[PDB]
Design a protein around this ligand. Structure first.
Ligand code: HEM
Ligand SMILES: O[C@@H]1CCCC[C@H]1CNc1c(Br)ccc2[nH]ncc12
Length: 371
């Protein structure tokens, strides 16, 4: 898949993302590539204003459109938030707002940096013939020196990549149900659990490469959007595309497919019930590349793995299925311990308690799916 833009090695990540744009877009790339220096020094805004409007007709393929969305998205964060100390721009200059929106509408994504921009497309191998480890990778873009954006985006990415090993097993799960091959199904559920158990270890790198004070006080400010944000009460003006201001949520891993596809597969109904948690997760499918959205649809349309397992009186399938739910819980528990360290504690020196409660609701709903 192919039709679902899922790579066998990296899964939902864009494989081998492009680093360079056609020379026709060097004006864009000169800004995006030196944001630390241009923001700190005060030139970034003036430079986005002194930019000519450029067509998107010269972005041939998908890997190039995605790079451009990533260049334009980071530039728009830097323009809107400035040095990241509270001086806000509420108008995105038409000379950049129009191509960012035009390109966005092409990709059916919103004109704002989303998870698939700053994680899934925002990386590269150092030596392409070595393996995908932290030490052999880097990000393409950052916002400020010391904002810990490499460790944050890459460790999220390395977790996505570790989840890839399980994603490629989902076909065999539904096929084993169809063909009623109980042994094949059990082996597939235990292999899915095994890969999600391994993906926990990967999360541990977050402590080595991200510092709480930098993440809370700097990176978090540049990932923020303008949806129910008091600093832009009623959103951001995309000059020359909308006369009205438009609200768009900031980047969030609630735009991720890596856990959502296992929730869906296992019948953990994170999106049911009407609550705030399920509203957010459903609203956030809009900020997900369409092929990945479609993929979660296809999963939701398949016969329930949970129903199959429960209908069969089979302790071993029930344990294999609990092995996957448990592994999701372990990850979300580790994840909540990270949010305590990187947000709750730093803030005591979109609110802290609202975000922990969202994560707790998702965790509790994973917990409740065990047998
Ligand atoms: C410094 C490290 C991290 C912090 C502070 C952090 C914080 C958060 C917060 C506050 C949310 C709530 C949704 C939102 O506010 O957008 C969230 C959601 C989420 N984050 Fe993280 N995160 C971190 C690392 C990671 C990593 C490395 C991954 C691995 C890919 C990850 C995966 C997720 C997922 C899947 C969700 C959606 C809710 C769920 O499925 O449980 N996060 N994160
Ligand atoms: O709302 C949260 C407030 C604090 C800054 C992050 C933001 C969540 N956004 C994320 C991005 Br972008 C990339 C990877 C992620 N992993 N987990 C969350 C997450």
């Amino acid at each position: 898949s192919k039709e679902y833009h899922i790579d066998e090695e990296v899964g939902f990540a864009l494989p081998n993302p492009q680093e360079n744009l056609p020379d026709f877009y060097n004006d864009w790339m000169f800004i995006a590539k030196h944001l630390p220096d241009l923001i700190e020094s005060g030139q970034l805004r003036e430079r986005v204003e002194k930019l000519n409007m450029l067509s998107i007709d010269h972005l041939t393929d998908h890997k190039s459109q995605r790079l451009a969305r990533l260049v334009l998205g980071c530039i728009t964060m830097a323009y809107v938030w400035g040095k990241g100390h509270g001086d806000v721009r509420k108008v995105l200059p038409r000379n950049i707002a129009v191509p960012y929106c035009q390109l966005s509408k092409k990709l059916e994504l919103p004109p704002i940096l989303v998870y698939a921009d700053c994680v899934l497309a925002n990386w590269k191998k150092k030596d392409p013939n070595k393996p995908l480890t932290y030490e052999n990778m880097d990000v393409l873009f950052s916002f400020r020196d010391g904002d810990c954006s490499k460790g944050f985006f890459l460790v999220s990415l390395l977790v996505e990549i570790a989840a890839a090993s399980a994603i490629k097993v989902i076909p065999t799960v539904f096929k084993a149900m169809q063909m009623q091959e109980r042994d094949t199904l059990l082996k597939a559920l235990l292999e899915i659990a095994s890969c999600l158990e391994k993906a926990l270890q990967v999360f541990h790198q977050i402590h080595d490469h991200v510092n709480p004070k930098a993440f809370f006080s700097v990176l978090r400010i540049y990932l923020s959007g303008w949806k129910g944000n008091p600093q832009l009460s009623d959103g951001l003006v995309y000059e020359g595309f909308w006369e009205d201001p438009k609200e768009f949520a900031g980047g969030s891993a609630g735009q991720s497919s890596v856990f959502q596809c296992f929730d869906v597969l296992l019948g953990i109904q994170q999106t049911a019930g009407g609550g705030h948690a399920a509203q957010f997760l459903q609203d956030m499918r809009r900020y997900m590349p369409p092929a990945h959205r479609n993929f979660l649809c296809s999963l939701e349309s398949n016969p329930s793995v949970r129903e199959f397992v429960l209908s069969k009186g089979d302790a071993g399938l029930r344990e294999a299925y609990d092995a996957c739910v448990k592994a999701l819980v372990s990850l979300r528990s580790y994840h909540l311990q990270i949010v305590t360290k990187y947000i709750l504690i730093p803030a005591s020196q979109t609110g802290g308690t609202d975000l922990m409660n969202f994560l707790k609701t998702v965790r509790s709903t994973t917990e409740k799916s065990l047998l």
